[PDB]
Write a protein that binds this DNA or RNA. Structure first.
Length: 668
RNA sequence: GUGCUGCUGUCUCCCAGACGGGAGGCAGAACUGCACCUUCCAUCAGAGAA
DNA sequence: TCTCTGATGGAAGCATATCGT
DNA sequence: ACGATATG
């Protein structure tokens, strides 16, 4: 399934819900401990502080004694088998408990008929009642039945709770056990600590379901706010939620499949009404505030099978056979940078209208009609200011370490002395004084000036959204990455200056780190949204993206795979299929003649090539986008660089590793 | 609702101390702008910086 | 030596089937 | 037809 989540806030939570939350957490922790003890194996427990304790077998045995297991050793085998079955450690086919929570009825409640029912077994064929297929029962349930026959399986839970809530507690605790056990299983493969639930330290989602996993809830919508009604055993509690711009103007109607169909509005630029289905809700507490996690299923946009066959045809190497798309697909190719956010080129199969002609494998040529650059310079002055301040912070950190060395040592090395005067002093823009006492005073004055300039820059980067120039603000721009670099450099400089007096801090630059992470996440989301919007506006169904997996680069800001994966996921959710293309020599090869050209370094936005013995120039980013699209459509028909080695008599032997090289080589 | 995301006034804590920096609490003023699947866990590494 | 990511994992975000009234 | 478990 496909999930999307958000959170809503509830302000005046009654005492009954707080009691339910605390009791659910307590019984969940008890369930963690009980299952781990039934496993009968020592394990490491980590508390809030961080210290690790090795829980001995005696603690396990006495906890089982407290639960009701007077002789755990006598029933050690069956207890171990049941505990392993609950943790999904048996073979996935013919599982004792398809869902872990389903084990509560035979574990906690008295007078339970679980384990003696054959109604859902597939052997029940009607076209008898006495066909008792209890011989093929699972070991997990068979051990469970045996222990109840011993009269010791129904444990004394720390607090009385309804069967439905116990199911949610089992769900959370067993999912935590399954998450932990796999990590521990990997630990012994190399040749893992345990964290328990807490009300506020390590909270769990107290879940309310509509089919048995937790108490039922009735979610409605009034005005512009949700209304959650939890059916607690004590009574019905009605909760109102603070209105959210995520679920703006919501309308909800109960369906016939125990689900709520929510229709709302997410953004503000458009009035598009997203539709989702809610079947389970989650309650959490953080910073003394109670939140509800609305995790709703949604239907991704339908993708035509012809798009799939076209992607399969185009992604395959030339030395292969795949069916032709045979339809009028749309292929949009982009490259990712930081001075421009990205550049795109759009083409349609089977059309040529006064555009950059590109061959298509086993088809006619195509002309790129729409070519453009999205995201870049918003205001030149602001970008220049961020660049200057980032360089100033960089050279300030260098100068501060050099000054700290100079004050104590009293002398400088030949390399450092030349480096300081030639590079660091002009970069930090601070006059140099020999007296070390007030040298730190001048340094502090310069740092204060830097902080004031940074505050002014940030205030401008905030006022971009709150002036009459609100409409001219682009969706994304190069100022995001520059501001991220400036934040990193300023954090670095402040961290160096704060320890100038050295010849820790539990909190240090937490505001700066939080701002850096939030700005990074927002920049990623805005870039993904801009790419998706550009792809959708042109009607493109195939997207060829430069594979950036192979300073002033995106790699210094994000993981190489993270951006790519996010874009793939969003494009697929919007019913667009995307492929990553090898970006080698894309920025250095002309898209007109497929020849090496000149990429200017004084102005990195201009690419020079030769056509008909007359030097032409073009934009170096649309050139890369068109090269990516041409490479995708031609199925790597032409290579630029060949890896080879010399054996003898000046005759180089071509090295063949990738399949693309093999296909091209046999075509010549 | 979480962020982009700040300003003014005032107060508290911390690190140098007399040039300064960091972390927070309330009260106001301007703003109707853009985007948003998230929760929890364990191991191993990259960074930087004393 | 210490913090903070960051990698790369792991677990999650319900549905049908009867009897009994 | 809806509640109470119980199991794919």
């Amino acid at each position: 399934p496909s999930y999307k989540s958000s959170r809503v806030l509830v302000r005046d939570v009654p005492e009954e819900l707080v009691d339910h939350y605390e009791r659910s957490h307590r019984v969940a922790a008890f369930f963690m401990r009980l299952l781990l003890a039934m496993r009968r194996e020592p394990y490491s427990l980590r508390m809030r502080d961080g210290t690790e304790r090795e829980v001995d077998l005696d603690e396990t045995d006495d906890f089982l004694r407290s639960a009701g297991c007077e002789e755990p050793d006598a029933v050690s085998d069956d207890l171990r088998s049941f505990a392993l079955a609950v943790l999904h450690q048996d073979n996935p086919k013919k599982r004792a408990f398809l869902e872990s929570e389903n084990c509560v009825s035979i574990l906690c409640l008295e007078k339970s008929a679980s384990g003696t029912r054959y109604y859902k077994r597939p052997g029940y064929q009607l076209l008898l009642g006495r066909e008792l297929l209890k011989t093929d029962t699972r070991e997990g349930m068979a051990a469970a039945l045996r222990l109840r026959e011993r009269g010791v399986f129904p444990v004394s839970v720390p607090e009385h709770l309804d069967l439905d809530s116990l199911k949610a507690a089992m769900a959370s605790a067993a999912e935590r056990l399954k998450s932990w056990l796999a990590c521990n299983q990997r630990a012994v493969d190399e040749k893992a600590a345990v964290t328990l639930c807490d009300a506020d330290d390590s909270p769990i989602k107290v879940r309310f379901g509509l089919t048995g996993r937790g108490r039922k809830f009735v979610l409605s919508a009034a005005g512009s706010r949700f209304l959650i009604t939890v059916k607690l055993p004590c009574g019905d509690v009605g909760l109102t939620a603070v209105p959210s711009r995520y679920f703006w103007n919501p309308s909800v109607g109960r369906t016939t499949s125990n689900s709520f169909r929510i229709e709302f509005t997410k953004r503000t630029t458009e009035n598009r009404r997203y539709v989702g289905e809610v079947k389970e809700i989650g309650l959490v507490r953080q910073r003394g505030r109670y939140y509800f996690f609305i995790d709703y299923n949604f239907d991704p946009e339908e993708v035509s099978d012809e798009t799939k066959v076209g992607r399969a045809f185009f992604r395959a190497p030339l030395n292969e056979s795949r069916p032709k798309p045979k339809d009028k697909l749309t292929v949009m190719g982009i490259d990712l940078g930081i001075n421009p956010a990205f550049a795109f080129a759009v083409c349609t199969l089977g059309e040529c209208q006064d555009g950059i002609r590109s061959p298509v494998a086993k088809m006619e040529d195509v002309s790129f009609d729409s070519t453009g650059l999205r995201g870049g310079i918003g205001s030149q002055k602001l970008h220049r200011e961020m660049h200057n301040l980032s360089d100033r912070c960089f050279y300030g950190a260098r100068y501060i370490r050099l000054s700290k060395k100079l004050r104590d040592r009293g002398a400088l090395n030949d390399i450092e002395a030349r480096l300081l005067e030639e590079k660091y002093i002009p970069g930090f823009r601070i006059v140099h004084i020999e007296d070390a006492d007030e040298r730190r005073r001048t340094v502090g004055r310069t740092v204060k000036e830097i902080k004031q300039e940074y505050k002014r820059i940030r205030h401008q980067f905030y006022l971009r959204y709150h002036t009459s120039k609100r409409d001219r603000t682009e969706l994304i721009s190069a100022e995001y990455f520059r501001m991220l670099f400036l934040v990193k450099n300023l954090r670095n400089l402040l961290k160096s200056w704060n320890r100038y007096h050295w010849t820790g801090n539990p909190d240090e630059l937490k505001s700066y780190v939080r701002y850096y992470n939030n700005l990074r996440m927002d920049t990623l989301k805005k870039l993904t949204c801009a790419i998706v919007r550009t792809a959708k506006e042109h009607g493109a169904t195939l997207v060829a993206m430069e594979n950036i997996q192979r300073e002033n680069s995106l790699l210094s800001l994000w993981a190489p795979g993270m951006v790519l994966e996010r874009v793939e996921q969003e494009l697929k959710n919007e019913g667009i299929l995307a492929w990553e293309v090898d970006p080698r020599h894309t920025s250095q090869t002309s898209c007109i003649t497929d020849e090496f050209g000149y990429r200017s370094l004084v102005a990195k936005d201009t690419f020079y090539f030769e056509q008909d013995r007359k030097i032409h120039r073009i934009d170096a980013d649309v050139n890369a986008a068109i090269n990516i699209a041409r490479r995708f459509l031609t199925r790597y028909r032409s290579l630029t660089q060949l890896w080879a080695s010399l054996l003898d008599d000046g005759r180089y032997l071509v090295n063949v590793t990738r399949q693309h090289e093999r296909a091209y080589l046999e075509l010549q």
